[PDB]
Amino acid sequence: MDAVKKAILGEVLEEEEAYEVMRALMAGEVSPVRAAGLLVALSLRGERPHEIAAMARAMREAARPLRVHRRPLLDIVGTGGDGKGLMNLSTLAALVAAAGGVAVAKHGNRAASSRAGSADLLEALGVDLEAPPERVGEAIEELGFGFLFARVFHPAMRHVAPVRAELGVRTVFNLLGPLTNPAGADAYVLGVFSPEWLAPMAEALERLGARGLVVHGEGADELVLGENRVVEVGKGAYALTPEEVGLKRAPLEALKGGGPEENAALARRLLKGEEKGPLADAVALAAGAGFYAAGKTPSLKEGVALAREVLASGEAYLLLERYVAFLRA
Amino acid sequence: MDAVKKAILGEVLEEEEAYEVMRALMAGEVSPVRAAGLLVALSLRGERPHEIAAMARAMREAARPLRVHRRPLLDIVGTGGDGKGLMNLSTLAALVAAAGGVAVAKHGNRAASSRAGSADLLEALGVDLEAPPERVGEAIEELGFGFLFARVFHPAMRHVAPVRAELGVRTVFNLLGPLTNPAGADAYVLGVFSPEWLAPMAEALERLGARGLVVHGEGADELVLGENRVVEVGKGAYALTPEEVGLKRAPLEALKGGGPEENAALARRLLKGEEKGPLADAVALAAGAGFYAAGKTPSLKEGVALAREVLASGEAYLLLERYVAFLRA
Amino acid sequence: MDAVKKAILGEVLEEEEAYEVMRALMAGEVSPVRAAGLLVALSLRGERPHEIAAMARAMREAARPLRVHRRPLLDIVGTGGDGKGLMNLSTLAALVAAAGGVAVAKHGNRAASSRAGSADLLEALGVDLEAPPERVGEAIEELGFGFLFARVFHPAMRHVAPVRAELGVRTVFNLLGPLTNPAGADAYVLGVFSPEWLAPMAEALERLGARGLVVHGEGADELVLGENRVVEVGKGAYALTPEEVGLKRAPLEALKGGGPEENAALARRLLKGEEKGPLADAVALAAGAGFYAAGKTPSLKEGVALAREVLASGEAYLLLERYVAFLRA
Amino acid sequence: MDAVKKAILGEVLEEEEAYEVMRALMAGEVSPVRAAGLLVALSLRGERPHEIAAMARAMREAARPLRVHRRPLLDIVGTGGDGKGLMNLSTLAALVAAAGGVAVAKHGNRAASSRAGSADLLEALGVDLEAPPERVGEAIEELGFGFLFARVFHPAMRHVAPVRAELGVRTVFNLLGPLTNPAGADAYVLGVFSPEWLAPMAEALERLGARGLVVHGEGADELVLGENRVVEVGKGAYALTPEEVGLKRAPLEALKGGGPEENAALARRLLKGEEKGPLADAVALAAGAGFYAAGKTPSLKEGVALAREVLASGEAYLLLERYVAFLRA
Ligand code: NA
Ligand code: NA
């Protein structure tokens, strides 16, 4: 009985076995049926800290190599799996943070069976997702921004994706994605689908030597214009509200956005500093948290203040275009 | 919520949700990945009787139709896979019960290897496994015996066979095999893989409107010549030893079989009433349980007594001969 | 399993082995690595007609079941992979054939990534690609036309698609796509990406009990306004030119088109009988081949004549809207 | 078109395209799926010498560094997997050559079965496989012998080892193993699994600037006591029989070892100069070929004579003991 069978049988895995299971998955040695079975089994009983850590290690080792010489290196990313179906603002917040001087390496992917993933949005904005890791790394060093497409850095994710899409439920990959930034990001604004994961993911980041905030927004895996719950690595837990940082509250519905084409249009207007509603406020909130997490500003309020200025300046769109041109070289 | 997704989430399904999941599976509507996921989920958190019975009804509905007017209708069958490599005791016990006057419709299949399964044994004895359902039904009506070859009656199982093989672990389908008698048998001596399945399977039978005994014998999914554990549908669990029904104990080794021709040779001696060793005692034990389960005898003791006489008469061999000829007519 | 290794070693598979290999692939029993190895080996060695037909059967069996009474049932479909990048006219020709009185079940998919696949075009024209299989079946019975979206009918392809995309080269799946119509179409105008596949594919069609024409047009997997090469089931190989059916030749460039948006408007003008250029002639040629293949017209020229009349009448556009509305709640 | 895709398409690679493909593979830039595809394609069409040599250099470049000043430096190694399952005598022959004064750096690995790989045998004899490269290099300089454990010197093989095992068939890596000596050995007795590989591998050796003999013995990838086929770098092809060098012929079966423990026992007796049968003659034959390949003796005959003397003296066992102690120091 190999480690995969043990996992399917629902038995807790020793660190070495957890590592082996993910190594096999990343190596393309596991059939779709057994991959589906092991993911469901792990999701039912709940993956333990040592298991997640071991699987994360297997993923980092299987990743296409990339070394970025800029630090702090910020990632604004979420676990996904919240079901709220809100627009993915992390990508826009990440661009604002980069336009403000923070080195950014945002980790993202395509959305299951919607064109809404961060990778989908960026592609619609002109980003060539096929660009090699070395070119993306050069962009981060020279321009301060880079988008790390999951499938490119972790090839196996191309096969894991359909399995996750079909199962249609949360799996260990929802937790592993944020924890496996392939550029070695050390600063985070990491959103989670449930408050239960705020502390665990913050502790995971701390063990990795990373810093930042783990966030949850009234059900969504991103900061929203409401009573957000946060856990700052090394410090503790606290609430983060819009009024706290000079922003107004808005229902979650105001952050839903629309179809892929509409969101692509919204993105341009937002980055250009033309769109001014709740969507702009939410991007400013996340970017502000990013400036704080990356040490660009000493506080969240100063971070949000800077983010509002940067967003309104339209510099984030100018940066996006520099990025697009850089990759098309 | 979608029934299949609910299953994958690890939630207990309402009875008709369980029916729907199995209906979808048998209809070829579920993808291999989702089928793998929901089978693993159901197995890990444990299938409940009302789910098991509902899925058995859905599977029975997808089978090739066959209506038998005779009742009670007995089946001696098990969940299989106990890896004991025993002689086809239930097949011989079924022939004995039929020779004793009880209408029998024994459900079976081939064994995936050189070892002989019930279908392999009967084929070696002259049974034409290609006989159409209608002909087998006529045999039950006229001769009181029929063998229901799973491959002929359950074409829909081809939709899940590959997934079951690849998972490499037992699933709800192992439980459903004996609960999907295509002739609608209502009396059973149903063997299970382990003691933990005695009660759930007994309740599933009760919910299906059936009667009888669910049995387990020292690792084997059938009654053996040792300490058996049984659950009488509608009553409760109790132990069943050879001595309390007038038989002597014997090790499992004494009940081992081999290939089709070897088992056929043994079957001939046993059914003719010529071989009186442990194999004969084991057949009498299962057939006796069958007589009791069908209400032919008032007790297990009287059932075993009747079975010993029927076996010794050689009449079960005559019945087999007539059955073989009937399918060839 | 064993047959998979045999394929990887470059050996020709027996019919049963080919069926088993594809059955395993579609069932999710093959790891990405072994799937990649098998597909490359098959492609380099050269798939034989008996293998192709056997694998088509395995795929047809794994698909979401759909049975329709309408016959003859026509499909105009291609293997893709010609790298010619011409406008996919098969969809328009199919609508014309249906408007002319032939039951049509056109098999199609989205295109990576022009969004220039048949599914992409129909969606832009108003077709709800999320319609359930049963509803599409009802459309074929009631309206005489249905579009079979590969993603809906072949869910098992979800775990296979990633391997194909990563390999980035043509594989046996290019050949199987046209041979796995989920509605059981029996009449075809099947385009192939290279002349060497005309004969093998015609034999595959015959082995599957289908009829019609396998076509290739100066590099494209569709009939064009030049010297087409054809292999008709039951007749053999021959060339087919526009002039012999009353049409004028035109450069392939005239059949290109553009962006998805341009082709939607293009498609409308063609179906309404407004566009009269080479594109209209090419649609008439394919639709005409369809009428002949299905038995609606006794000759190819008569089929083209009927297609030209139908196109000019605008009835194909009315059919499209009838279909679009049919799928709406 | 990138080189990996070209390989997958079955086209012969230009020398530097082959170097690039292997460089990418060793750098972790190639996905398991594309790696699987290219390995199968290369194996089926047949790797050419210019490709093999280039890939060997790319692999050598990725290995952990190890500079040995002593020259000539001899290696006695094979491609493995011939199926004959004979005892791996190359290790013993290497020790004899070293005891005879030739600097030896024998390249080896484990044998997942019977873990009777060369590394398995040496470990059973006391060698600490965890010894760092520097220590092994010091042993070669001081003792004249060193065993290069592939897993220690080729950490980059972690990017492909999984794919190799998963494919389960021979690939170019079988050929590359003997051609990637991490100490830069320049003299060889290289065994191949089939005679068709003699000339290509001899050319690959010459291309790499190496000298020696490429051998094949009646189905085995080692010199046997029968009609051996040889291709000598800078000399050409010829047959080599035992009688030509003063040895007696013996059936292959006399050269068959046993399990790992039996081989360790036989190895001890041989090195001590105690075993005097065919196994001793076979060791002398290979060691003699090594002496000649390294330029220690003027002919194969004198090389075998020197080898028989050294073997009988027991000096090779004493060397082994010194080596084991040296590593444990
Ligand atoms: Na007798
Ligand atoms: Na005709």
Can you put this structure into words, describing what you see?
The structure is a homotetramer of 329-residue chains. Chain A is α/β, with parallel strands linked by helices and 329 residues long. Chain A contains 15 helices and 7 strands. The longest helix of chain A is centred in the C-terminal third of the chain and has 16 residues, at 278-293. In chain A, strand 6 and strand 7 (236-240) form a beta hairpin. Chain A has 2 domains: 1-67, Up-down Bundle (Transferase, Pyrimidine Nucleoside Phosphorylase, Chain A, domain 3); 68-329, Pyrimidine Nucleoside Phosphorylase, Chain A, domain 2, CATH 3.40.1030. The first copy, chain A, starts with a helix and ends with a helix. In chain A, strands 3-2-1-4-5-6-7 form a 7-stranded mixed β-sheet. Chain A has helices at residues 3-8, 15-26, 32-45, 49-62, 90-99, 118-124, 133-143, 150-153, 157-167, 172-176, 198-207, 260-271, 278-293, 300-313, 315-327, and strands at residues 73-78, 103-108, 145-149, 187-191, 211-217, 228-232, 236-240. Chains in contact: A-B, A-C, A-D, B-C, C-D. The complex binds sodium ion (2 copies). One sodium ion binds at residues 273-274, 312 of chain B. Chains A, B, C, D: Mg(2+) 2 binds at residues 221-222. Chains A, B, C, D: Its EC number is 2.4.2.18.
